[PDB]
């Protein structure tokens, strides 16, 4: 009868303890004028990758994206945020936010972009975004003047190479974004997994209350599994007409990850993302049910008491 | 009046510019005894080529029976349990893990692990007991925490390695008294001539030991540091052997040539130049130290004794 837990939540079995972080990781390396994965809603739809089995003669509608106005990214130093910054200033006259959806700890050493790095990338799983956050402010904060290893990862997401520095100067990316000219808001979002009711929650609240103009630009490490999930979040609540199909094929074709069923694949050591890949695919099919059936009155009822009462099903 | 005097070179280097950022694996414990092993009754093999020596010259093997010491790399529990089996063997005496290193070190679920800054200088500039205080702080910090052991690949960085939480943490005195060895410590920097106060505590105690003491010296890899000290209690067991009979045997039952050769390093490598010009000359004034003091029974330590009579570069 009792169910400890639901679809949507299959990353909370998993014991935090077992992933704790080990490395400064290089979000970064600074090399391109902008970050990878670089996408907006106003971009052009190219031909659909070939592991998601789509159809590449289907049209999406692009209904709703000319005012859309979000775009996403990878992780990105203080200089390709700037030039991230100023491409989208072409774009709007709003107020543009950098929409931060990385629950692991990270921040810039030496203006060098950096995350506290445990398998998996799961430093801080189960952790509350107030806990996650004081960790962040805590490492930061204890690496002024203190010398680090920074590396990035190489064979079985292990450190290889890098460089080792005596840290003068920390920031953390709220400061960066500011420096930049753009809003910030973090929603601590896991790797990997589907966001958590918290995430979506804090999320909804946030989008509630943007001014018209705002233009959002979501990034998570390498800006795809996360920050496609928000994006086409945001695309489903701004755009409701706009059929399940189209939403997920435009975002996927502007340069996202797909979000709708396909043969999923892994090696045999990343196997332990299949059954997260399936949960994702089945919580974006919910989540458009939710925005369908609560836009009506304005979304009076949170996502989080939603799901509740309507679980989702494997 | 200088600075620094010969044989304290690495005082004018700074500490804050190498310190600790790594747990380095010490051993793979792959092999059944630490690498470069080797024991005074050990034959002599032909010379390495880079040292440039003549191999057709054969030194005294005068004392060699009777000197009962050995040197190695790091090793796992495991070793330094067949290491001290081998050793039981050849005396009934104490056998000591003389160990060398001053970088903090230890193990980690029975992992030999040494906390690593460049150069390998993560305690360089402490006292011996500031090094053993950090080293008894970080292995008990470890201790249930999450750590990161890796090899040095490239560069001497980090290469692959794994991530365990901790069960358990031992200090390498307590593996050695585990294998039935006593213990004693020289927290020498590795890469450079051990201090005047290295020396001294040597010296002070190589003269506590019994007639049939076995000591099994070891650094990180049994090559530097080792074999200063193999060399050192060499020359003071054995006086009437020339320093270059002492140098040579030492070297060919597979310790490092303290003699002189023509050094080359690689360009990354440069800064090690003048630590190695440094040790030729140091070991030449350590054997001066011996051959003027043995008479009276070193009524004077050896710091003393340098400081009125300096090295020469
Ligand atoms: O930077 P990468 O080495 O290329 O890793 C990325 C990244 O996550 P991590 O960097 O922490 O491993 C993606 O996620 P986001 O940070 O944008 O959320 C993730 O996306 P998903 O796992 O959610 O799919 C993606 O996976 P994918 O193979 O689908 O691109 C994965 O790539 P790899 O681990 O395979 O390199
Ligand atoms: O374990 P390795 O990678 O082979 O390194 C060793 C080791 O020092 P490190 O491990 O910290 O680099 C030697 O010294 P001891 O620990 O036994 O004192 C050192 O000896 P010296 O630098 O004093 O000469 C030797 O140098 P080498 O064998 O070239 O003389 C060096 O080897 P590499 O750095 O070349 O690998
Ligand atoms: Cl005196």
């Given at each position: 009868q009792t169910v400890t837990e639901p679809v949507g939540?299959?990353?909370?079995?998993?014991?935090?303890?077992?992933?704790?972080?080990?490395?400064?990781?290089?979000?970064?390396?600074?090399?391109?004028?902008?970050?990878?994965?670089?996408?907006?809603?106003?971009?052009?739809?190219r031909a659909p990758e070939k592991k998601f089995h789509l159809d590449a003669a289907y049209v999406p509608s692009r209904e709703g994206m000319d005012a859309l106005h979000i775009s996403g990214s990878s992780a990105f130093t203080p200089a390709q945020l700037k030039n991230v910054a100023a491409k989208l200033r072409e774009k709007t006259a709003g107020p543009i936010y950098?929409?931060?959806?990385?629950?692991?700890?990270?921040?810039y050493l030496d203006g060098i972009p950096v995350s506290w790095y445990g398998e998996r990338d799961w430093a801080n799983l189960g952790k509350s975004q107030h806990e996650a956050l004081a960790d962040e402010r805590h490492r930061l904060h204890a690496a002024l003047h203190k010398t680090v290893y920074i590396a990035p990862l190489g064979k079985h997401?292990?450190?290889?190479?890098?460089?080792?520095?005596?840290?003068?100067?920390?920031?953390?990316?709220?400061?960066?974004?500011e420096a930049a000219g753009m809003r910030y808001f973090?929603?601590?979002?896991?790797?990997?997994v589907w966001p958590t009711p918290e995430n979506i929650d804090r999320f909804?609240?946030?989008?509630?209350?943007?001014?018209?103009?705002?233009?959002?630009?979501?990034?998570?490490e390498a800006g795809v599994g996360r920050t496609t999930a928000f994006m086409v979040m945001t695309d489903m609540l701004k755009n409701p007409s706009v059929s399940l199909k189209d939403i997920l094929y435009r975002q996927h074709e502007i340069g996202g990850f797909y979000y709708g069923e396909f043969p999923i694949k892994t090696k045999d050591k990343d196997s332990w993302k299949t059954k997260y890949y399936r949960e994702k695919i089945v919580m974006i099919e919910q989540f458009y049910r939710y925005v369908q059936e609560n836009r009506a009155?304005?979304?009076?009822?949170?996502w989080s008491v939603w799901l509740k009462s309507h679980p989702a099903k494997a």
């Open positions: 939540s299959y990353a909370r079995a998993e014991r935090p303890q077992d992933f704790e972080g080990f490395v400064w990781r290089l979000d970064n390396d600074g090399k391109e004028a902008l970050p990878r994965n670089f996408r907006t809603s106003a971009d052009a739809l950098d929409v931060d959806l990385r629950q692991e700890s990270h921040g997401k292990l450190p290889e190479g890098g460089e080792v520095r005596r840290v003068q100067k920390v920031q953390t990316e709220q400061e960066v974004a973090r929603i601590a979002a896991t790797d990997h909804l609240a946030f989008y509630r209350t943007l001014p018209q103009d705002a233009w959002l630009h979501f990034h998570s009155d304005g979304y009076q009822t949170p």
